[PDB]
Curated annotation (Swiss-Prot):
Removes the 2'-phosphate from RNA via an intermediate in which the phosphate is ADP-ribosylated by NAD followed by a presumed transesterification to release the RNA and generate ADP-ribose 1''-2''-cyclic phosphate (APPR>P). May function as an ADP-ribosylase. It comes from Aeropyrum pernix (strain ATCC 700893 / DSM 11879 / JCM 9820 / NBRC 100138 / K1). GO terms for biological process: tRNA splicing, via endonucleolytic cleavage and ligation. The lineage of its organism: Archaea, Thermoproteota, Thermoprotei, Desulfurococcales, Desulfurococcaceae. It comes from the Archaea. This is Probable RNA 2'-phosphotransferase. The chain holds residues 37 to 216 of 220 of the full protein. GO terms for molecular function: NAD+ poly-ADP-ribosyltransferase activity; tRNA 2'-phosphotransferase activity. The keyword NAD applies. Its EC number is 2.7.1.-. The keyword Coiled coil does not apply. The gene is kptA. Keywords: NAD, Transferase. Belongs to the KptA/TPT1 family.
Amino acid sequence: VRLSKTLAGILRHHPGRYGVRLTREGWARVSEVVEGLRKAGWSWVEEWHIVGVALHDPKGRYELRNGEIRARYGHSIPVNVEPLPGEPPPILYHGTTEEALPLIMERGIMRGRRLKVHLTSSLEDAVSTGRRHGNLVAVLLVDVECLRRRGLKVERMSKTVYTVDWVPPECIAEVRRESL
Ligand SMILES: [Cl-]
Ligand SMILES: [Cl-]
Ligand SMILES: [Cl-]
Ligand SMILES: [Cl-]
Ligand SMILES: [Cl-]
Ligand SMILES: [Zn+2]
């Protein structure tokens, strides 16, 4: 029912479901997205909403170019999006469920349905993120350098969002249980 939430699903997980075709670079035509949303019963949707959604997103979730749009990260579909300039901070956060900690302590942070593992520089974001699946959020502090030495590359997809294949258990510097 939320336009943005729905848009991110279309550009990250199910284009065709809405008749939208994406390139390897992840791009899509705004018009094609608009029609697709209309055919899905969103009658009032117009191209300007889509631009508004993209230009006002706080996380910098989307990108635009000559009548096109794509998500910058969070894809569960194979796609290639180039990173943004800027070395990562020494520590990056990642939210999740306390219930996931037992496993994570052993295995570390695993991929999930998304292609790569996402890490945020914003503590607040990590919380709301954890709060999205299951409750009793547990935010983990990830030592980036530790990752780089593990050889795992850390790429910047948006001002506050970065990704890596996985986070080794040993690169977790702190676990904070919201229940404590
Ligand atoms: Cl699909
Ligand atoms: Cl998602
Ligand atoms: Cl998100
Ligand atoms: Cl993730
Ligand atoms: Cl910056
Ligand atoms: Zn606006």
